[PDB]
RNA sequence: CAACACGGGGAAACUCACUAGUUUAAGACAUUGGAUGGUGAUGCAUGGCCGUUUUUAGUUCGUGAAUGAUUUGUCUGGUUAAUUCCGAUAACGAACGAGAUCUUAACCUGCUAAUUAGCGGCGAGUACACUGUACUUGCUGCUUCUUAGAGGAACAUUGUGUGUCUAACACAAGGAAGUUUAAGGCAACAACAGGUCUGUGAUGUCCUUAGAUGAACUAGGCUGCACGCGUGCUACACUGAUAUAUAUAACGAGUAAAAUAUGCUUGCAUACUUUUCCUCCGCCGAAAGGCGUAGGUAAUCUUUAUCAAUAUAUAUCGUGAUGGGGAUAGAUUAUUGCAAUUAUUAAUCUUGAACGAGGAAUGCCUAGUAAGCAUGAUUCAUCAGAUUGUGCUAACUACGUC
């Protein structure tokens, strides 16, 4: 089970949420792996019109995605996925194994 | 399908139009943000994808719009603000103030911190263009607000 | 430096063992003497990258670029065209401007690298896509290597 | 010729008065709209006389117009 | 009217339909201008 | 170096409330003082911790 | 079997793995020879020469280097080489010993027991460098 | 200063506000009034946003006290990154700024973790010569490296000098780090008639609004050249060029039109399938490039456990405007685009200028910096000598003073 957002706070809550919740209905999890942090930069001039000093400056827009992923069938996955969910992280379920 | 940076960026710029829009509309209370009176609201959006600082400011704006006096206005306003419990306010009116040279006035009261994280953490700002027939006004609010913890305290029982 | 009084054991049996230069001089030396490879044709004409504007100066060149292609190909067995106009990139003299780089001519490479293929010292692998070498060619440049080894030995 | 688009008009008032509201882009130099079939000079030049008329009311951001309709307007269609 | 699938005024802001200054990384389309207002409300932190 | 009127202030309320608490040892007294003060950050912990051990 | 430690000078790290052996020392696909300029291959037989070779003849080496240019990679590979000798030592031989052997190593210089510290600064705008600046006029 | 590679303003058209000219209603509302649009006039009417003042260290209030403006606090002195602290002190108590504070990078995790990262383990070969070394194909206990979370770690620690012996400084030792560990983000009080109404559906007034100063179309122009000044690039060579060879890196970035088919006379009419951004790979092309197709919504494929160039090695010049140098010019075949001509851009051959180390002047810089060498991104239908990042090669010289 993949998890992104843009929002740090709740993907972090989430995450120990869902492990929290795979135990609780004993399903077999390897550790959240979290994934390389994908930026949004745009490096803008501070004057708007360009007059006056070079002045540059430089904001990030940092996405974040985790994977933690269940030896399990597909039902009781999805079930406590869907359940457990804060709105501004998005989920997609991967398919595993009997 | 798109990319996950181009998911997220497509997004802000569809939370920053209906932001813009919602604070353009705005009267009796702030807006909620995106849902992830209300009847007309909610059908425009949906046909488009098939007390606060902006609030006082706003309420300022539409004080000088009914052509008060500047002083007792922006002292009500400020009063409110401090009175229902913050920390520190500022609150600038620019432009002409009734005549032909522009000047502005500051009105300011609490502590009102500009520095670090805590600044930008707990002050809330708010920009209002007013407009009268010698041309338009610009209303700046900021409240501080830091009642998550307090910036300053040596923390001992 | 030729020879040297090193403080490990080295070896004695693989390209590592012997200098690259001398590898590929050698190694250059016995394709030709050999007669493994010719030219064809167009390739007299080659300038390595567009900016050189001279022919290869050191005359024996050919099968020095062709000895020094088995090397890479013994070191990564995935390779294909691009590697090679990339590994043998240099600078181009932009005149009344700053270099940049630009890739090495391909034809002859691409030459060399399908005459080796008819040859049969490579093999294309079309699934986990590359040329390498075969093991024929393997053993060849391991038996010249031995050869080198031995040499500088005694 | 000039053209009087009136079967694209009477068919905007029809969209107008089922909906309640309006949401379209402002310019009309750009000829094809994707959510009905009638050309954005059309919708352009029909909410410019309704709005005058104040049938609709504009709200406005970014070039989309924002436009809910009056009760004035919904008696006019119907009859 | 002339070709415009390419070159200059293919292309204009979002926001306001500038002729010039139009920022097109990530594909958003916005004039720095208009960018430096609601870079905030579109997520854009800045630490540099 | 030097230490500014807040870290002081901390500093000076230890030993008003908890001078027998204090020992030569700066790393005890880092507990020492994290135990009876919160603290928000720790470099500024530390300092008061360096402050009060001074 | 085996043990691991390592050095890091700027973008470069060489983690080095040190084996029961025969005095075999590698450098990912090369050989500890291999290094091409005189004065650096010098550099990185320098502290094997310093303990003596006939106390490294028990053990096969394995370098894995990654980052940086050739400077920066052999002073990382000394490193290395240097946190390779103490850590079989402080594993196989004898910790005494190892103390020892590192106060030997580190009277000599103590770079390759502790790294360059040394970081780039970034580039500002107004100018090439980081703190350098274009040309000003008047 | 705080103009002059500045207007993110790298202009064939579009662009553009200009010039030569051509069009149009998209003129709401009730002939006509009336208004609607305007990179029109006005930044010395203005809003916003930014530059400066000033990135130094400054500012203010409450109460008390000293015709009044005012002053004190907010200071002889010590000390400091610093109105930072001590200390004295008609003041005592504050608030802002400073500092603290946010993002990296530095060190340490016998803790947190293993996917789309590695390692071992083990089957299978090919070499070496083994009850081990080297190299590739098949399967699957470790987490050091790769990634990314939480948490630790420096406080002037200890010693010794100097110091109101306070605040604190100096040296040595310890230590990953001792200057606040290094770099940014951050940005008071109050101004300037600083810049921008050529970004805005921010905007007053004034102009304009039908042989329009609006929208749009066709050329031409923004770059022409007796001449003057900025800023960069390339050079002026043997500590080098020339030809081969060895070594190696980090940041990135990657969704309404084309093709194919049918009916009619290149053109017209219609359908339908996908082309669309990165390019591996395989053939063909000196070279540019062409054709065939694969993998990629991305730690996975392009491609980055290897993508670079100076370095450095062997060769060739043997020092002579020289084979340094590539101005200036001619013939080409390509690529993008409707259009390439005022060389668009690209390559091949040829053409082979100045420049002999730079006056008066003046720039930037103290540690991975300065300098040298590259390279990603931005504009982009098309293009870096630009800007902005990123790496590598790794100096000198004080280490202070007015």
């Given at each position: 089970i993949a998890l992104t957002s843009k929002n740090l706070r709740a993907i972090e809550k989430v995450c120990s949420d869902i492990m929290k919740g795979a135990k609780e209905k004993n399903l077999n999890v390897s550790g959240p792996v979290r994934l390389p942090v994908k930026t949004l930069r745009i490096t803008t001039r501070k004057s708007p019109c360009g007059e006056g000093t070079n002045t540059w400056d430089r904001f990030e827009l940092r996405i974040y995605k985790r994977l933690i992923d269940l030896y399990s069938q597909c039902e009781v996955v999805t079930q406590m996925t869907s359940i457990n969910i804060d709105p501004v992280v998005e989920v997609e379920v991967i398919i595993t194994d009997s | 399908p798109i990319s996950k940076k181009r998911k997220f960026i497509n997004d802000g710029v569809f939370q920053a139009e209906l932001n813009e829009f919602l604070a353009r509309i705005l009267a009796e209370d702030g807006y909620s943000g995106v849902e992830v009176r209300i009847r007309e609201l909610t059908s425009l959006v949906q046909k488009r994808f098939f007390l606060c600082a902006m609030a006082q400011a706003e309420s300022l704006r539409y004080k000088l719009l009914k052509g008060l006096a500047v002083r007792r206005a922006c002292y009500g306003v400020l009063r409110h603000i401090m009175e229902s419990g913050a920390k520190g306010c500022e609150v600038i009116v620019s432009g002409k103030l009734r005549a032909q040279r522009a000047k502005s006035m500051k009105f300011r009261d609490g502590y009102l911190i500009s520095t670090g994280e805590p600044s930008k953490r707990f002050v809330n700002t708010a920009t209002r263009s007013a407009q009268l027939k010698q041309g338009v006004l610009g209303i700046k609010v900021k409240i501080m607000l830091?009642?998550?913890?307090?910036?300053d305290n040596i923390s001992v029982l | 430096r030729l020879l040297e009084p090193v403080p490990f054991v080295k070896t004695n049996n693989c390209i590592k063992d012997v200098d690259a230069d001398l590898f590929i001089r050698s190694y250059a030396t016995h394709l030709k003497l050999h007669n493994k490879?010719?030219?064809?044709?167009?390739?007299?004409?080659?300038?390595?990258?567009?900016?050189?504007?001279?022919?290869?100066?050191?005359?024996?060149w050919y099968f020095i670029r062709a000895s020094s292609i088995l090397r890479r190909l013994y070191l990564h067995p995935d390779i294909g065209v691009g590697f090679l106009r990339r590994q043998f990139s240099s600078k181009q003299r932009r005149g009344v401007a700053p270099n940049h780089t630009s890739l090495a001519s391909g034809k002859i490479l691409r030459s060399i690298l399908q005459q080796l293929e008819n040859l049969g010292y490579v093999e294309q692998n079309p699934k986990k896509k590359g040329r390498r070498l075969t093991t024929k060619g393997e053993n060849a440049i391991n038996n010249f290597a031995r050869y080198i080894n031995k040499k500088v030995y005694n | 010729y000039s053209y009087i688009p009136k079967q694209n008009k009477k068919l905007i008032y029809e969209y107008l008065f089922k909906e309640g509201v309006i949401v379209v882009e402002k310019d009309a130099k750009i000829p094809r709209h994707p959510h009905?079939?009638?050309?954005?000079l059309h919708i352009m030049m029909t909410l410019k006389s309704l709005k005058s008329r104040n049938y609709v009311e504009e709200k406005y951001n970014w070039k989309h117009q924002y436009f809910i309709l009056n009760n004035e307007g919904i008696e006019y269609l119907r009859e | 009217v002339h070709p415009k699938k390419y070159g200059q005024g293919s292309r204009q802001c979002r926001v306001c339909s500038n002729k010039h200054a139009i920022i097109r990384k990530y594909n958003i389309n916005i004039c720095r201008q208009c960018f430096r207002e609601r870079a905030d409300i579109i997520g854009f932190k800045k630490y540099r | 170096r030097v230490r500014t009127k807040t870290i002081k202030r901390a500093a000076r309320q230890i030993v008003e409330?908890?001078?027998?608490?204090?020992?030569?040892?700066f790393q005890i007294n880092k507990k020492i003082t994290e135990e009876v003060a919160i603290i928000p950050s720790k470099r500024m912990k530390n300092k008061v911790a360096g402050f009060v051990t001074h | 079997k085996r043990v691991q430690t390592f050095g890091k000078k700027k973008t470069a790290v060489a983690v080095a793995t040190v084996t029961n052996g025969k005095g075999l020392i590698k450098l990912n696909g090369k050989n500890?020879?291999?290094?091409?300029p005189y004065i650096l291959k010098t550099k990185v037989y320098e502290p094997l020469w310093l303990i003596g070779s006939g106390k490294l003849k028990n053990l096969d080496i394995r370098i894995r280097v990654k980052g940086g240019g050739q400077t920066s990679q052999i002073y990382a590979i000394r490193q290395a080489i240097g946190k390779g000798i103490i850590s079989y030592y402080q594993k196989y031989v004898d910790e005494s010993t190892k103390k020892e052997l590192k106060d030997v190593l580190l009277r000599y210089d103590r770079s390759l027991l502790v790294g360059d510290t040394r970081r780039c600064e970034p580039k500002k705008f107004g100018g090439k460098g980081a703190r350098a600046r274009y040309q000003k006029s008047y």
């Open positions: - | 830091p009642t998550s913890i307090l910036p | 490879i010719t030219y064809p044709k167009w390739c007299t004409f080659v300038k390595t990258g567009k900016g050189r504007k001279l022919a290869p100066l050191n005359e024996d | 009905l079939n009638v050309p954005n | - | 409330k908890y001078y027998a608490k204090l020992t030569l040892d | 500890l020879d291999l290094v091409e």
